[PDB]
CSV table of C-alpha atoms in Angstrom, one decimal:
chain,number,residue,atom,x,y,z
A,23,UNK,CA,35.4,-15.8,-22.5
A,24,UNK,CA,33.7,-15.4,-25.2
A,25,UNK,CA,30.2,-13.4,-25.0
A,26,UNK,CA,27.4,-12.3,-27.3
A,27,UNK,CA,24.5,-10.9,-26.9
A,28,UNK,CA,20.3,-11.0,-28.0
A,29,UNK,CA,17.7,-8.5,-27.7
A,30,UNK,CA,14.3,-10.9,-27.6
A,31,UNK,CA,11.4,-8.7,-26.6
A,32,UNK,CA,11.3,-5.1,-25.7
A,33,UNK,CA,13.2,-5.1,-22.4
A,34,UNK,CA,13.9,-9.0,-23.0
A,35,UNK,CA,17.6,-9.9,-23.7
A,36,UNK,CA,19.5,-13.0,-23.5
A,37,UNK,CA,23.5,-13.5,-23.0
A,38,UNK,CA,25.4,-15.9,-24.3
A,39,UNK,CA,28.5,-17.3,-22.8
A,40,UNK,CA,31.0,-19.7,-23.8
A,41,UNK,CA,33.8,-21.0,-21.0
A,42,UNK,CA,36.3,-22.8,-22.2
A,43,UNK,CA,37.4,-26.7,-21.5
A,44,UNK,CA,40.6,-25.8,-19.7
A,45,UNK,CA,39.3,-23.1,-17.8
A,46,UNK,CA,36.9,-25.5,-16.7
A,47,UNK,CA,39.7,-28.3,-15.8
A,48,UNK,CA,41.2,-25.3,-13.5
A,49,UNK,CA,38.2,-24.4,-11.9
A,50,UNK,CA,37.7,-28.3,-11.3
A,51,UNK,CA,41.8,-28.4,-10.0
A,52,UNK,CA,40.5,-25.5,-7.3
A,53,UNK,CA,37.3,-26.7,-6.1
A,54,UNK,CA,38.8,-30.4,-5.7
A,55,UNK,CA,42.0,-28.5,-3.9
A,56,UNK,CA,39.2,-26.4,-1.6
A,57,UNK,CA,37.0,-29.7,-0.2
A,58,UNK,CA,40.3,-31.3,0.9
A,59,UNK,CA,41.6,-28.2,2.5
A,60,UNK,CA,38.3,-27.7,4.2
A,61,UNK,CA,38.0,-31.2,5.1
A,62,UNK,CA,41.6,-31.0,6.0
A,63,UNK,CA,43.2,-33.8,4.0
A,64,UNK,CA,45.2,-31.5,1.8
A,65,UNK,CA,48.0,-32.6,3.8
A,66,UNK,CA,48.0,-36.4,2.8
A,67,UNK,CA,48.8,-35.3,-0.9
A,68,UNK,CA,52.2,-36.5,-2.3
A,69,UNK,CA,52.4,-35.3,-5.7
A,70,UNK,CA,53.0,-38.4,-6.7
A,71,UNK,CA,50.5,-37.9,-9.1
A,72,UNK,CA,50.3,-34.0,-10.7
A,73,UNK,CA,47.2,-32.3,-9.9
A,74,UNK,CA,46.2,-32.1,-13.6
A,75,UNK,CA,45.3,-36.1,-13.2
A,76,UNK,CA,43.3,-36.2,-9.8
A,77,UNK,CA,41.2,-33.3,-11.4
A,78,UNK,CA,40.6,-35.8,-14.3
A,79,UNK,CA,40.3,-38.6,-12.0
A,80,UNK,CA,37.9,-37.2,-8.9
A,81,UNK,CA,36.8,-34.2,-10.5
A,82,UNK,CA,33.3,-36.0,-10.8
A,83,UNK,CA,31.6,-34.9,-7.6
A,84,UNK,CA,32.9,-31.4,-8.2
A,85,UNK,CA,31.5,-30.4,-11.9
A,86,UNK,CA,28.0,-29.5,-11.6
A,87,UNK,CA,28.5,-27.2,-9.0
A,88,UNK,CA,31.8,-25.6,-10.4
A,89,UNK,CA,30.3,-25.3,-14.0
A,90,UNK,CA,27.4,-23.5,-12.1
A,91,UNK,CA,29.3,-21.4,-10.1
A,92,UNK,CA,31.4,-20.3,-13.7
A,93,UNK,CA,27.8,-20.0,-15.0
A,94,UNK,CA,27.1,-17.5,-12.5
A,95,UNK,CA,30.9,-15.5,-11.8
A,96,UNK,CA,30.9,-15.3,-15.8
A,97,UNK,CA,27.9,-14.1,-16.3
A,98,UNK,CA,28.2,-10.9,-13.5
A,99,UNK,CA,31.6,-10.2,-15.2
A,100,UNK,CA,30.4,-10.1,-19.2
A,101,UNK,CA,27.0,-7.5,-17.5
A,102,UNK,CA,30.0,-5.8,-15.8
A,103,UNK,CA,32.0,-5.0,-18.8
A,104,UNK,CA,29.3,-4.2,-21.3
A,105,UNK,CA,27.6,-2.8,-19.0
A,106,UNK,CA,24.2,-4.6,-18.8
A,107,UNK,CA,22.0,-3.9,-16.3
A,108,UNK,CA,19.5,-6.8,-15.6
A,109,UNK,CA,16.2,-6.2,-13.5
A,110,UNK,CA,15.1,-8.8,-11.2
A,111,UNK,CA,17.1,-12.1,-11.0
A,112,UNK,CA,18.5,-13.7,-14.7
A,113,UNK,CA,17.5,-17.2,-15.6
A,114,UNK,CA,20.0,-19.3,-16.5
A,115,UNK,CA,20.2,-21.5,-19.6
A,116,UNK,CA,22.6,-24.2,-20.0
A,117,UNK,CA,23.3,-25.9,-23.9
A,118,UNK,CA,24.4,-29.0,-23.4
A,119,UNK,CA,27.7,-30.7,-21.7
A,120,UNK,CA,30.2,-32.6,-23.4
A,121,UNK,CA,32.9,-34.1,-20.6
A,122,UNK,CA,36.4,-32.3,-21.4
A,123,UNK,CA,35.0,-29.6,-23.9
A,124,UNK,CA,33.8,-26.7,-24.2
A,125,UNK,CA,30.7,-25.3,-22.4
A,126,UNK,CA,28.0,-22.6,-23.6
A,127,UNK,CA,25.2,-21.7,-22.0
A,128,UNK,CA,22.8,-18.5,-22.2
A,129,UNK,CA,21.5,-16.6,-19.6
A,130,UNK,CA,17.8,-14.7,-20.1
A,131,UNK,CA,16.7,-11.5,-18.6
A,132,UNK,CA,15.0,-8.0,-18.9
A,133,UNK,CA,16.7,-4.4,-18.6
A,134,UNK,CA,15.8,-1.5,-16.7
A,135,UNK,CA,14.0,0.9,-19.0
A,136,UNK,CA,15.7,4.4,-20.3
A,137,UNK,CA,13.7,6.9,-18.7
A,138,UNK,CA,13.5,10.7,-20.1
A,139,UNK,CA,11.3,12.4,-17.6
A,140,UNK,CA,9.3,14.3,-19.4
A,141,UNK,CA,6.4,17.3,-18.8
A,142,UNK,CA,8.0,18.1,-15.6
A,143,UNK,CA,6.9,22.0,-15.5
A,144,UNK,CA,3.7,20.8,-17.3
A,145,UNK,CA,2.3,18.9,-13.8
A,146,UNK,CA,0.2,21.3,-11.6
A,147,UNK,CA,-0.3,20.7,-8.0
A,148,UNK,CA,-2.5,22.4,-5.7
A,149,UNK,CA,-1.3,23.2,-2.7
A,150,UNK,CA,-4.3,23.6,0.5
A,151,UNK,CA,-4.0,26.1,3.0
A,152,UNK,CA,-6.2,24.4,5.7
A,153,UNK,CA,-6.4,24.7,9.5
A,154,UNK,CA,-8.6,23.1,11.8
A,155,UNK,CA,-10.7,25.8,13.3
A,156,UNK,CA,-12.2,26.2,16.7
A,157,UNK,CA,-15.5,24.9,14.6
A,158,UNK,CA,-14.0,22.2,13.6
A,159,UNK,CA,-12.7,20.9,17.1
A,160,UNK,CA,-16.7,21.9,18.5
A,161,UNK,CA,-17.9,19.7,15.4
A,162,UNK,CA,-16.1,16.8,16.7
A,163,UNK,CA,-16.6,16.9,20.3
A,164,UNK,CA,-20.6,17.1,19.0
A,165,UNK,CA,-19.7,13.4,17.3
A,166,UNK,CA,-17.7,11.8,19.9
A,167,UNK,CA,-20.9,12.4,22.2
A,168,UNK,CA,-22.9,11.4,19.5
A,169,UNK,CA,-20.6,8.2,18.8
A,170,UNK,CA,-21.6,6.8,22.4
A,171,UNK,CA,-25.3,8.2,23.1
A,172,UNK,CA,-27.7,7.3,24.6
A,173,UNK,CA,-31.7,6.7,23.2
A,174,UNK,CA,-34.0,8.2,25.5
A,175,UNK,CA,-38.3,8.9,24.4
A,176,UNK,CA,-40.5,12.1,23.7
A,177,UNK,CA,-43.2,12.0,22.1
A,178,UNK,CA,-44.4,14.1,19.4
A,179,UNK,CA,-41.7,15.3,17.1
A,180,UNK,CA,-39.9,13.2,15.2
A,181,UNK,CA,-37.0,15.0,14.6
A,182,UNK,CA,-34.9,14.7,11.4
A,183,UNK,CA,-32.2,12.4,13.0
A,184,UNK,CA,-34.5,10.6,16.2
A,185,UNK,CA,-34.8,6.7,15.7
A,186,UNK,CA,-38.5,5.3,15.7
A,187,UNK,CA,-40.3,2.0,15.6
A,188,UNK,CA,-43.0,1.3,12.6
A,189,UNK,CA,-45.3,-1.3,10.5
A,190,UNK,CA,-45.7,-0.4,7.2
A,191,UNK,CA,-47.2,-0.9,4.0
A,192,UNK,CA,-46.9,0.5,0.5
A,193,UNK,CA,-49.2,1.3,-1.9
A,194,UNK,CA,-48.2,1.6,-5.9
A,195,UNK,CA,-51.7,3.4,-6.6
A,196,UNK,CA,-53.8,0.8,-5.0
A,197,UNK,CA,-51.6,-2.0,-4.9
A,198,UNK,CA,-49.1,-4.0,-2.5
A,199,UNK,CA,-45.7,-4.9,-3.8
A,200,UNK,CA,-43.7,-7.6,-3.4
A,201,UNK,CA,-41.3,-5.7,-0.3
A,202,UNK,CA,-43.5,-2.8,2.3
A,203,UNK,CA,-43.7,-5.6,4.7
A,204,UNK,CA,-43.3,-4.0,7.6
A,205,UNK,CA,-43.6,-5.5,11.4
A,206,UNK,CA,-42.7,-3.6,13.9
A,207,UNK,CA,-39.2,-2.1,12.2
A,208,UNK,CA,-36.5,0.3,13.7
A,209,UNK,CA,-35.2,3.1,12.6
A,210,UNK,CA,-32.2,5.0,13.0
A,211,UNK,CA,-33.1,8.1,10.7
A,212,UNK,CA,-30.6,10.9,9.6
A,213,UNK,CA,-28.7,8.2,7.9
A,214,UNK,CA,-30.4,7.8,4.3
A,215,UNK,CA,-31.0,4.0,5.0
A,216,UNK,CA,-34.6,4.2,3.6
A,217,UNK,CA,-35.3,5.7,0.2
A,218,UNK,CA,-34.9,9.9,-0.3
A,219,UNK,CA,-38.1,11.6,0.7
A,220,UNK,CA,-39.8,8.7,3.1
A,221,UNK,CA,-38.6,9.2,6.1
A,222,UNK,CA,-38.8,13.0,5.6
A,223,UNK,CA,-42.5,12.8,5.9
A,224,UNK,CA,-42.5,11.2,8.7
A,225,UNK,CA,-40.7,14.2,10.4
A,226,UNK,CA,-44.0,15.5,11.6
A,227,UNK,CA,-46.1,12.6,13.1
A,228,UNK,CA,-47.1,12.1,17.0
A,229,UNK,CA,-45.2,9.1,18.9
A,230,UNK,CA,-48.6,7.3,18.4
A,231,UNK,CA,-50.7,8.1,15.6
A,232,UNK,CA,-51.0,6.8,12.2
A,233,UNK,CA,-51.2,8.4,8.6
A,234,UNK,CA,-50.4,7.9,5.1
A,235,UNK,CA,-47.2,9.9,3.1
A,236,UNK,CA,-46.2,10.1,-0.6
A,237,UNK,CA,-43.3,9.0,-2.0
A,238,UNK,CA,-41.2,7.8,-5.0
A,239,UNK,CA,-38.6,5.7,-6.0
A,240,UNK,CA,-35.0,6.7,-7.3
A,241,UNK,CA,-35.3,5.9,-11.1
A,242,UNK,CA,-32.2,3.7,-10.7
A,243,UNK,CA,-33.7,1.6,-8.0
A,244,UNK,CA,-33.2,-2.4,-8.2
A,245,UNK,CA,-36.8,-3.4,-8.4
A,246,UNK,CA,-37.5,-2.8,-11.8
A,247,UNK,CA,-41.0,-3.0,-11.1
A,248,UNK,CA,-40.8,0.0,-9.0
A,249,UNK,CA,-37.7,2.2,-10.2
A,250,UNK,CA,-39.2,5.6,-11.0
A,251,UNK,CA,-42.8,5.0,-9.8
A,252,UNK,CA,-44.7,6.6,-7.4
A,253,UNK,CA,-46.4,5.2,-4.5
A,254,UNK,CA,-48.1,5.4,-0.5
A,255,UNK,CA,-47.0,4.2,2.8
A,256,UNK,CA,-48.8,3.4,5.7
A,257,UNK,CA,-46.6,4.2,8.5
A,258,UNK,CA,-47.8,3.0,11.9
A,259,UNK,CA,-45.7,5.5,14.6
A,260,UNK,CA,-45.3,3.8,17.4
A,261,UNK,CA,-42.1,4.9,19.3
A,262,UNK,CA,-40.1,8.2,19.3
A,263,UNK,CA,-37.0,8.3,20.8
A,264,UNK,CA,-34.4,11.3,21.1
A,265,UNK,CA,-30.6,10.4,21.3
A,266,UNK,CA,-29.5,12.2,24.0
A,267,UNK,CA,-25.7,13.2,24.0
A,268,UNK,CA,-24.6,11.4,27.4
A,269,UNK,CA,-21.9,11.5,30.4
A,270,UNK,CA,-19.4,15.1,30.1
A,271,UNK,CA,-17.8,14.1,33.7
A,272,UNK,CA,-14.5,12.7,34.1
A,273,UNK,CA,-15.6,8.5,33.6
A,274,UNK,CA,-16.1,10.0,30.4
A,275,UNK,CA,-13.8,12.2,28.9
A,276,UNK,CA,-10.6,10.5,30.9
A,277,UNK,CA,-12.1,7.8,28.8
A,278,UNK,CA,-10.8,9.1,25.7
A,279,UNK,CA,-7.2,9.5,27.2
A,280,UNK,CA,-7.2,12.3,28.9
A,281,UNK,CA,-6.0,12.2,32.6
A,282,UNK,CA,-7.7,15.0,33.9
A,283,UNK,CA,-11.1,14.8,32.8
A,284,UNK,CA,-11.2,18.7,32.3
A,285,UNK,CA,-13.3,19.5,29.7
A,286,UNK,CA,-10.8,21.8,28.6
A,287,UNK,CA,-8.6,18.9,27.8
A,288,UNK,CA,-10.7,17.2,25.7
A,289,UNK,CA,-10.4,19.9,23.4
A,290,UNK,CA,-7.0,19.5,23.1
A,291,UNK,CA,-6.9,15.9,23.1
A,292,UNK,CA,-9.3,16.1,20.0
A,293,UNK,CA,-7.6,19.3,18.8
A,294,UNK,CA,-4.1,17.8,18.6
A,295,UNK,CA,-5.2,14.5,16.8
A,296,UNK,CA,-6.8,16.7,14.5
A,297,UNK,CA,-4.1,18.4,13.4
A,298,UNK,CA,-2.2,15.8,12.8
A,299,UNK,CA,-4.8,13.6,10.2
A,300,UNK,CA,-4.7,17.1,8.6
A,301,UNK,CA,-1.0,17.5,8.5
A,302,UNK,CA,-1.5,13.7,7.0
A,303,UNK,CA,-4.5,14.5,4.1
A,304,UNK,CA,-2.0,17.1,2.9
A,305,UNK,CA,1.1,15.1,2.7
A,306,UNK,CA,-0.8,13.0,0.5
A,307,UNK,CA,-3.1,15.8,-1.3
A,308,UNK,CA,0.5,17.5,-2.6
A,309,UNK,CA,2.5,13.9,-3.0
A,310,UNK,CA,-0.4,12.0,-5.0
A,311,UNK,CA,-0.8,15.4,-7.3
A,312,UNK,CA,2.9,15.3,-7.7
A,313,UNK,CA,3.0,11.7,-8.8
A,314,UNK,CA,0.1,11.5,-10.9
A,315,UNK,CA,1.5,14.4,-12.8
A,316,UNK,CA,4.5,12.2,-12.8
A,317,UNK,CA,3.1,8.8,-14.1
A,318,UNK,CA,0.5,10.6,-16.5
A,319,UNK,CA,3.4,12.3,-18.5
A,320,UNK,CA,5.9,9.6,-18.3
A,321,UNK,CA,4.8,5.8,-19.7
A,322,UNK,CA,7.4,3.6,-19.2
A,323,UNK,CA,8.3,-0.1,-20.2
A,324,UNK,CA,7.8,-1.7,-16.9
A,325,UNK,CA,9.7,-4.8,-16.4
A,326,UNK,CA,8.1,-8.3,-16.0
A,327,UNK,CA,10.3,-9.9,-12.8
A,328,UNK,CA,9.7,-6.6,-10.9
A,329,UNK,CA,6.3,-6.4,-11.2
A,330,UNK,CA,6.1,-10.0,-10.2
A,331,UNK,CA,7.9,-9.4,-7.0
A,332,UNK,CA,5.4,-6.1,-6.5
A,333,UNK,CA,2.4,-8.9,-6.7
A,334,UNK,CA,4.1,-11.1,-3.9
A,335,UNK,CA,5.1,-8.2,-1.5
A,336,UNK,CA,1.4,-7.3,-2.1
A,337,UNK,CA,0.2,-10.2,-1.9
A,338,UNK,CA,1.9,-11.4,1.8
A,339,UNK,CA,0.8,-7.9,3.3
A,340,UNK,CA,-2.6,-8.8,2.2
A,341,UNK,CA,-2.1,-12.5,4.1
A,342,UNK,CA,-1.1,-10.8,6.9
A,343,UNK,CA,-3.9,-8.8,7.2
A,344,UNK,CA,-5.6,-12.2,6.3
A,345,UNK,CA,-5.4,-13.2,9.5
A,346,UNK,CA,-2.3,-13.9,8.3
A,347,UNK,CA,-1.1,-17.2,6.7
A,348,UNK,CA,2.3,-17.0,5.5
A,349,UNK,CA,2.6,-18.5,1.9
A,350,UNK,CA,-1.2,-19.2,1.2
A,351,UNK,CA,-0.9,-15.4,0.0
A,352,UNK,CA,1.0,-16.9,-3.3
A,353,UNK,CA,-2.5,-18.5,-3.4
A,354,UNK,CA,-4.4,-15.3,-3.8
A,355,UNK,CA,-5.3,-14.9,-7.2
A,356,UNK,CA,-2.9,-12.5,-9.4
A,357,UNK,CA,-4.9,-10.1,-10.8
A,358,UNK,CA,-6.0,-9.0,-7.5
A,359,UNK,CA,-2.4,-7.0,-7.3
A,360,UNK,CA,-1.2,-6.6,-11.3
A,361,UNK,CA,-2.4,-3.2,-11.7
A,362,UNK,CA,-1.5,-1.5,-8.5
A,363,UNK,CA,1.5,-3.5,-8.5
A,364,UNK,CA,2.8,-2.5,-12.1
A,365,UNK,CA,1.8,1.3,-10.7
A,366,UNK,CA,4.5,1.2,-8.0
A,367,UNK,CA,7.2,-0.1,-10.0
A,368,UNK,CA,6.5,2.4,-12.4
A,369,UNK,CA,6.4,5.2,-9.7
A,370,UNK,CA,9.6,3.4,-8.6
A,371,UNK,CA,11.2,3.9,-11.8
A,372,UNK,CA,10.2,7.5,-12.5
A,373,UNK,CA,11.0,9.0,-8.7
A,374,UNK,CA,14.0,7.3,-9.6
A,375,UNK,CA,15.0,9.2,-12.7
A,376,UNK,CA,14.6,12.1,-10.6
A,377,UNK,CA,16.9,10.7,-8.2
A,378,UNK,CA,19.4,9.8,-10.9
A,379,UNK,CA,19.1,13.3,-12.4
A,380,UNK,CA,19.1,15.9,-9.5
A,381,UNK,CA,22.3,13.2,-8.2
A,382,UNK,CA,20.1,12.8,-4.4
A,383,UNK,CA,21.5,11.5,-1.5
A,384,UNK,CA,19.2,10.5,1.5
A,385,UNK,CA,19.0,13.2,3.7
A,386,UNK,CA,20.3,11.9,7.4
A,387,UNK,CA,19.1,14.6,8.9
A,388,UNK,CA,15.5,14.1,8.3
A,389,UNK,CA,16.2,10.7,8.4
A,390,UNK,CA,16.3,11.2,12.3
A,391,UNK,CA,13.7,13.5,12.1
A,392,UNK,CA,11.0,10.6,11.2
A,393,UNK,CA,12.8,8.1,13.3
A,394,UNK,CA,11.5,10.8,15.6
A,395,UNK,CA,8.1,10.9,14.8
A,396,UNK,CA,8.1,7.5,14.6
A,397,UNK,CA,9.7,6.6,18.0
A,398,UNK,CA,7.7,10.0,19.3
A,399,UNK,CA,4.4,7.1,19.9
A,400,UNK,CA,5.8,5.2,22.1
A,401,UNK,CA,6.6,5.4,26.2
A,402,UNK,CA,9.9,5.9,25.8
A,403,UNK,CA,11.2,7.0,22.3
A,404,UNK,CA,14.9,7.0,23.5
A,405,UNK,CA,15.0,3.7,23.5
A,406,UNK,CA,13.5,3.2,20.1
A,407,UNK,CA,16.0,5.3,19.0
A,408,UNK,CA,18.9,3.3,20.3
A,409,UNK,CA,17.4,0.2,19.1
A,410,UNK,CA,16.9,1.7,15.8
A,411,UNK,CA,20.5,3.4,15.3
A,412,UNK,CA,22.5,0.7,16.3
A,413,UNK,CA,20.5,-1.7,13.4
A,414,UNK,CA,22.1,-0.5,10.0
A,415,UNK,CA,18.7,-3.2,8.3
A,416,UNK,CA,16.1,-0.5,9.4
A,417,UNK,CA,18.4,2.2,9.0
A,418,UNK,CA,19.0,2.1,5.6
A,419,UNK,CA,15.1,1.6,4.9
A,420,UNK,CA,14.5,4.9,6.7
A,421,UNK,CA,16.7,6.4,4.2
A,422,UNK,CA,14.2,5.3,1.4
A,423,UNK,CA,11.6,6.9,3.1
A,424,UNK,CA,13.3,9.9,3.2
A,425,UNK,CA,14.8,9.8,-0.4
A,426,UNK,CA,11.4,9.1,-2.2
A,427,UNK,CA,10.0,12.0,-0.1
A,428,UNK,CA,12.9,14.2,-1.6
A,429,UNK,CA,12.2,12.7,-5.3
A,430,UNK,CA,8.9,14.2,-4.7
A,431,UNK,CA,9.7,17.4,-3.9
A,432,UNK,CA,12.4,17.5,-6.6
A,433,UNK,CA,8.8,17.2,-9.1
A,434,UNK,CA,7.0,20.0,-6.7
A,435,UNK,CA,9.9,22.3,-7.7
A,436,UNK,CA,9.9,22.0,-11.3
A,437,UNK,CA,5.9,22.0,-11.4
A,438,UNK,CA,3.1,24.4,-11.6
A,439,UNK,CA,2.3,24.7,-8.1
A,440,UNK,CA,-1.1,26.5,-7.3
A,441,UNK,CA,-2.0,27.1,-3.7
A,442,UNK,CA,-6.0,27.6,-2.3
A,443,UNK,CA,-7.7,27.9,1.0
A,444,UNK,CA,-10.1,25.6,1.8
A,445,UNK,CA,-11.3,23.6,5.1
A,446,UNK,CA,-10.6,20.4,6.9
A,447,UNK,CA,-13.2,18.6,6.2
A,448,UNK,CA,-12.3,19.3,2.3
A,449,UNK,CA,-8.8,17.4,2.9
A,450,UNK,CA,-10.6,15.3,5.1
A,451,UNK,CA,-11.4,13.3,2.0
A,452,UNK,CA,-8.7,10.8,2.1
A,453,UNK,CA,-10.6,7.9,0.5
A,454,UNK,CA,-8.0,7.2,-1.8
């Protein structure tokens, strides 16, 4: 075979192959030899006639799927021996046939990119020392009740957080605008919904009687005709209610899961799930340091195909949150994936470098220590344990897991790793 090759574009490159007539006649021979054997007529063959001739005489319905099965076994061998190293699938280029000759053909693809991990010891990651504290755990406890509550009635002291019922009006400097139309509203104060400094003067009024407060607009706000100015409101207090953290006894607190409604197990029902987001906001506070550092110091030439196939996976775990609807996520416009998809094949690349250069091998013993965690949810873990040994599909992925958490800390070693106290709520922060 003969076999030369093209750099196009970057990682672009394109192969060119040239089989030859006879070793097509011989691969026609085979696959003509194969049908019959499979078909089991192979026996009824005299040699009367050589099997040079047949192959020239019934090779027909054979060809197109021999010269694209040499296409293909051709191709794999010239990437084998020269070493190429496509990423995502090839495309195939075929010149064009001539019966009994020759056949070239060309075969288009992209490489993996070299990668020479730099700044490693320049990254810095911060490592929180955190613990969820006894105030913490009280904090909580002081929202669930707050979560379900209940709205009783006072009257005269509207509280910075009590909800209330009003009709009001507002007044630029002796003028109504085109909103402060207010007929009998509610609201749920404590939770910024009306505009800084308005429902502050409220804070003071009786359940019942009326008065007039100050206040201004953020200079950002979206009425131009209002952003910055000053203005009045006539606030007619009608209601005052007080939520009133309900129920403590056992319909309640066995409500959250805990069998004995003991309030000394609510604690540690809340305690325990604590700890475990936090354990979860710091995995991610080290790992995301760790890989920005990464990705910030190392730009890559990212391959087309892969981040292509990054889109799609991203785009069928959107459907399936869709609702789901298998195959109407290729429908889902592409930009709505490119960037974070060309981010993991780039973080895909780079955690492998470090793979590549520290020579890593997934680590089967932490392997079955998050099959652990992971089984740990459910009534009985043995059982997912057995299910999940014996299949070598989910196995294998579990080792992924564990080898990309081991590229990470191969970047944690080499890197300028700070460490600071701080609280819960700080690494509470996990909005992205």
């Amino acid at each position: 075979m003969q076999v030369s090759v093209e750099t196009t574009q970057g990682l672009g490159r394109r192969v060119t192959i040239t089989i030859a007539a006879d070793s097509i006649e011989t691969a026609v021979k085979s696959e003509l030899v194969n049908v019959a054997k499979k078909v089991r007529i192979d026996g009824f063959r005299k040699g009367k006639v050589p099997m040079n001739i047949v192959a020239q005489r019934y090779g027909a319905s054979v060809r197109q799927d021999v010269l694209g099965d040499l296409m293909s076994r051709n191709f794999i061998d010239a990437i084998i021996k020269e070493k190429i190293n496509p990423a995502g699938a090839p495309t195939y280029v075929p010149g064009e046939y001539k019966l009994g000759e020759d056949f070239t053909y060309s075969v288009e693809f992209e490489v993996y990119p070299e990668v020479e991990l730099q700044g490693l010891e320049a990254i810095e990651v911060e490592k929180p020392i955190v613990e969820v504290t006894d105030a913490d755990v009280d904090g909580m406890l002081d929202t669930l009740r707050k979560q379900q509550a209940t709205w009783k009635e006072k009257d005269g002291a509207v509280e910075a957080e009590d909800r209330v019922t009003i009709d009001f009006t507002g007044s630029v400097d002796g003028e109504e605008f085109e909103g402060g139309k207010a007929s009998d509203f509610v609201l749920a104060m404590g939770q910024g919904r009306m505009i800084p400094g308005f429902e502050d003067g409220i804070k003071g009024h009786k359940a019942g009687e009326e008065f007039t407060i100050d206040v201004t607009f953020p200079e950002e706000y979206h009425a131009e005709n209002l952003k910055g100015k000053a203005a009045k409101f006539a606030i007619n207090l009608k209601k005052v209610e007080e939520r009133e953290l309900p129920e403590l006894t056992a319909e309640f607190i066995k409500r959250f899961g805990v069998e004995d409604g003991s309030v000394e197990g609510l604690r540690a029902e809340v305690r325990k799930n604590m700890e475990r987001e936090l354990k979860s906001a710091i995995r991610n506070r080290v790992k995301s340091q760790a890989i920005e550092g990464l990705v910030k110091a190392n730009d890559i030439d990212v391959p087309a195909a892969l981040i292509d196939s990054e889109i799609d996976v991203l785009r069928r775990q959107a459907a399936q949150r869709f609702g789901g609807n298998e195959k109407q996520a290729l429908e889902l416009p592409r930009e709505l994936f490119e960037e974070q998809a060309k981010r993991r094949v780039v973080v895909g690349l780079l955690l492998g470098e470090v793979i590549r250069t520290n020579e890593l091998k997934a680590d089967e013993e932490r392997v079955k220590g998050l099959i652990e965690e992971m089984a740990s949810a459910y009534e009985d873990p043995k059982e997912v344990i057995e299910f999940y040994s014996k299949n070598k599909e989910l196995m294998d992925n579990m080792r992924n897991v564990a080898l990309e958490e081991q590229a990470v800390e191969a970047v944690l070693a080499k890197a300028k790793v700070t460490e600071k106290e701080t609280t819960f709520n700080e690494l509470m922060n996990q909005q992205a």
